[PDB]
Structure formats: C-alpha cells, structure tokens
Amino acid sequence: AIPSSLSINWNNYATGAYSSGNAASDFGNAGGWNQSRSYISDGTLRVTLLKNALSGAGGLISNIDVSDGTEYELDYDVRFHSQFDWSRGGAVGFGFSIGEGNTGGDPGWDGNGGTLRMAWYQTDAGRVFFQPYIYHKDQPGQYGDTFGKSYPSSGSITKGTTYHVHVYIKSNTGSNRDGRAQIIINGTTVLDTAIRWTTNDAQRLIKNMTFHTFRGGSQTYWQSPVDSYIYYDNLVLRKIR
C-alpha cells in the first residue's frame, strides 16, 4: 500500500512493543522506522527520544509513501509526557513532503521540493510553543521557515496536554504563489498562507507523509540527559484532490 487515506488509533493493540512490521501494517509502508523507539502505551503511539542523542540517532524518522496528489489533509493528536523535559526543542507530529521533500540544511531554493512539518521551541526566557517548520522555494534561511508563527501566540504549551493538529497542504503551479500551508491547533489557526513550494512542475506533487520525531537542532544544547516520550493518537490522513 501506497495509500491515499489512513485511520489509525492503535486501539487494536496490547500495551507493549510496536513493530516496524506493525508500522507497515497500519501504514501500508514505513520507510526508516525504528521499533526500538516505538511502543504502544494505553492505546497511543509512544515514540521515544533517547538521552544524550539528537535527530535520527535518538528519535524516529519514517516517511510513509502515499498516493501522489495536489491537496492533502491530515489530523492527529499529540501529548508530551507529564514529566517531559522540553530542552531547546525538536520536530514533532505528522507532516507532508513535496517533490524532493527538502529537509536537513537543504533549502528548496532549486524549486524541486519542500516539506510542511511542525516543531516545538523554547525561547531563552522559557516560553515553549509549537511552530511551523517549512521548506519551500522562497524560504529565507538554510533551515526551516517558521513564518514567525507560534502556538499559543502567548504563553506556553503544557506537559501532558493533548493537542489536536490539523495539517493541510496544496501543491502550487508553475512559478505562482498559489499553494497552501495550513496548520490548526486545537481549533486555532497557527498558519494559513499562500506559498510557492516548487517551481519545477515535475516535483510539484505531494509524495509522502513525514513522521519525524526527534530533538534538535544540531548544537549540543538541544539534547536531554533522560529518555523522553511523546504520545500520538487518532491519525486521519486523507487525499483531497
């Protein structure tokens, strides 16, 4: 399966290990999955973020290939551990890839793709929030563009609190800015902006659904000395057009 729609809630599972074959079962395919980092706590998907490590070394980075399209949406629930250590931040939740799915320090300035993902950050003063993490044709930096948005707008997200993310993406056409990146958290729009993902109409299309959970960042201070847990539930992916 290279699906076009998925409805996972993990209720059919015993509290215990979650397999990469379990992953491919519920997902149709699961690229770089690491079952040492998955587990099924009380009917929720628990990814683990291990101590003293960053990025893929410490987290889970799978790309679920999905039926190509031009408009896609997904909804998911996510809950940081009640005793979680925020630290500086990292990537969280389900996102979309377009064309070459530009990540890393690889900006989509060539016009050949990008991503639409979310992160959490904590400022020097300690405000903690959700933020957009985008890669597109016109992203200002080497790294992901946040459009200076944050959820909440003021104050902080809080540990153990279930947030419902709605993600929505629409391929643009040619060199026009007729694309879309939309992110709604608990009913509030964080981001709803026209965007120019790509300028090469061959990488124009949405190709797969990212599942990228990790700390960092790449500097040493994004890390954390304990192992850490993030819980997911009730994912509904759906191809639109």
Ligand SMILES: O=C(O)[C@H]1O[C@@H](O[C@H]2[C@H](O)[C@H](O)[C@H](O[C@H]3[C@H](O)[C@H](O)[C@H](O)O[C@@H]3C(=O)O)O[C@@H]2C(=O)O)[C@@H](O)[C@@H](O)[C@@H]1O
């Ligand atoms: O303290 C900071 O805010 C610090 O962040 C640095 O930029 C980060 C950027 O925030 C982002 O976190 C990003 O995350 C990467 C990570 O590098 C790694 O590449 C992972 O493979 O991919 C993530 C992603 O796909 O982009 O990486 C940037 C990085 O610097 O690590 C800088 O802005 C730093 O100066 C700033 O003070």
Ligand SMILES: [Ca+2]
């Ligand atoms: Ca569930």
